[PDB]
């Protein structure tokens, strides 16, 4: 069983830069490509083995500006990544969905695809793809969606776990991110299967409150995102008491073919001294995984009702106490669940406790919980974005850029009304 990862844009590949550091640490691979000194297959799902003592990752970095990519090529992991896997266009998409979806995509995506095909060929028991992108930008939005379309028309039945960095309501680093987010969602809808949102305001607040770091950069955000990804692939990687594979999220968390948008949370986010302070048990972390002060997307689930929840546990955890904790959760009334789904939990347990990266801010914990939940707070989020989209669209601002790249008002209108239909659908199922 193997899984491959693709990183698109400027955010996706920095996230991957953290993620692969974490993976090499967890499987004990030196940054130059080999273990120091057998017969362990635990690494096989993420790193292929070649020649004599050389492990090359199964991921494809791709971006349209060569800057960050050859920055990786000059970084610490030069011998690690395959020379071909890093793929770099000559000029960016520049916050322009049409530019990243029609102009440069048409020449970069074919190379990316005939490359990922050889990756899948060398693979044997492919679980599926997992993609890392941000919809606020141009590259990851446009060519992201383009490669998603073509991956779906090539394979289709293989699941596509998509980790997408949505824009925050008040914190904004762009201007046309409403347009771009809408246009990306319009295809994310019917091409992604399990789409997990990761904001930035929520993670900023997490690093402010729990890790009590006051002036954080993107490095810390990406580090804990990598923590989450590794915590949800630990079940494929290692042998636990109750493992859950990639298809389980597709089965237990997507009740209707157009409702797949998951709030994610991780616990416990604890620094060094507070590790000594606190007595880590299961009830308090299972509780901590449910407050809005620990969700990776800034929204209030108190206004929404849950559809399904999935709980990956890592470390010295037995089913007894997790069962007791989720029973306490179900009998509490501060949170609520959709009446029609009467059993909305799915546990999964893996034995290995999460690792810690030297120089990181997280401490060595005995056990950890990664919660992936479904709700209607996301239906609230999409309306909040829709409002600011139509505000700009009413005056046709910034549209001349897209229509000069080649598109027209038709896509804008149809994506707007699709988001409206999706709003109606969420308000209907939260019945």
């Amino acid at each position: 069983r193997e899984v491959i990862s693709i990183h698109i844009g400027q955010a996706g590949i920095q996230v991957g830069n953290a993620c692969w550091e974490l993976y090499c640490l967890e499987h004990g691979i030196q940054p130059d490509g080999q273990m120091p000194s057998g017969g362990d297959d635990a690494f096989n799902t993420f790193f292929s083995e070649t020649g004599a003592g050389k492990h090359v990752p199964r991921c494809i970095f791709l971006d349209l500006e060569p800057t960050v990519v050859d920055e990786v090529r000059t970084g610490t992991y030069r011998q690690l990544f395959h020379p071909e896997q890093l793929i770099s266009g000559k000029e960016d998409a520049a916050n322009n969905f049409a530019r990243g979806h029609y102009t440069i995509g048409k020449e970069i995506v074919d190379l990316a695809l005939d490359r990922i095909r050889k990756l899948a060929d060398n693979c044997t028991g492919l679980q599926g793809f997992l993609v890392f992108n941000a919809v606020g930008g141009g590259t990851g939005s446009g060519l992201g969606s383009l490669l998603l379309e073509r991956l779906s028309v090539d394979y289709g039945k293989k699941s596509k776990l998509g980790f997408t960095v949505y824009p925050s309501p008040q914190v904004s680093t762009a201007v046309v991110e409403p347009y771009n987010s809408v246009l990306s969602t319009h295809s994310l809808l019917e091409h992604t299967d399990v789409a997990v949102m990761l904001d930035n305001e929520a993670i900023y607040d997490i690093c402010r409150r729990s890790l009590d770091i006051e002036r954080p950069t993107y490095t810390n955000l990406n580090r804990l995102i990598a923590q989450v990804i590794s915590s949800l692939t630990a079940s494929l990687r290692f042998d636990g008491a109750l493992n859950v594979d990639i298809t389980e999220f597709q089965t237990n968390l997507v009740p209707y073919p157009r409702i797949h948008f998951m709030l994610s949370s991780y616990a416990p986010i604890i620094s060094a001294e507070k590790a000594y302070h606190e007595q880590l048990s299961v009830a308090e972390i299972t509780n901590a995984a449910f407050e809005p002060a620990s969700m990776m997307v800034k929204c209030d689930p108190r206004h929404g009702k849950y559809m399904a929840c999935c709980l990956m546990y890592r470390g010295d955890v037995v089913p007894k106490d997790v069962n007791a904790s989720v029973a306490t959760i179900k009998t509490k009334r501060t949170i609520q669940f959709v009446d029609w789904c009467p059993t909305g939990f799915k546990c999964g347990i893996n034995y290995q406790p999460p690792t810690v990266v030297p120089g990181g801010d997280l401490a060595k914990v005995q056990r950890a919980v990664c919660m992936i939940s479904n709700s209607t707070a996301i239906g609230e989020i999409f309306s909040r974005l829709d409002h600011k989209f139509d505000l700009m669209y009413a005056k046709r601002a910034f549209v001349h850029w897209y229509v000069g790249e080649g598109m027209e008002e038709g896509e804008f209108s149809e994506a707007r009304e699709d988001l409206a239909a999706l709003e109606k659908d969420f308000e209907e199922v939260g019945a």
């Binding site: 090499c24 030196q30 940054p31 920055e71 970084g75 610490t76 042998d239 290995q352």
Partner: protein, 119 residues
């Protein structure tokens, strides 16, 4: 001044011994106690009390040397008789079957290839 990515990802924290320290493989063993020790009844300094005698072989065959009574071999609440209930009947009268099948396993193990059946 250096680039932010290189200020964060370096080689000092890795590859010396910390990889060995972080490849613990704590997921492997996770030892349980045992199965038998949960259900065993009796003192734990002694081997488990295996009863390998049935009422027929005990009474009709009179496996125990002293033929006292039919109901003496049954388990009662009282220590007056519980002391003298026999647990195992050791003898060739039982071990005849293993004698036979061990002779068979021996002749299976030790065989000559060049022995025509006729001769």
């Amino acid at each position: 001044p250096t680039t932010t990515q290189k200020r964060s990802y370096t080689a000092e924290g890795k590859t010396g011994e910390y990889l060995v320290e972080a490849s613990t493989r704590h997921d492997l063993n996770q030892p349980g106690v045992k199965g038998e020790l949960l259900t065993r009844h009796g003192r734990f300094d002694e081997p488990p009390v295996q009863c390998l005698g049935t009422t027929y072989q005990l009474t009709y065959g009179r496996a125990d040397g002293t033929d006292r009574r039919v109901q003496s071999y049954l388990w009662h609440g009282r220590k007056q008789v519980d002391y003298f209930v026999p647990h195992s009947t050791g003898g060739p009268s039982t071990l005849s079957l293993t004698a036979r099948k061990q002779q068979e396993w021996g002749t299976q193990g030790a065989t000559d290839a060049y022995l025509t059946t006729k001769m």
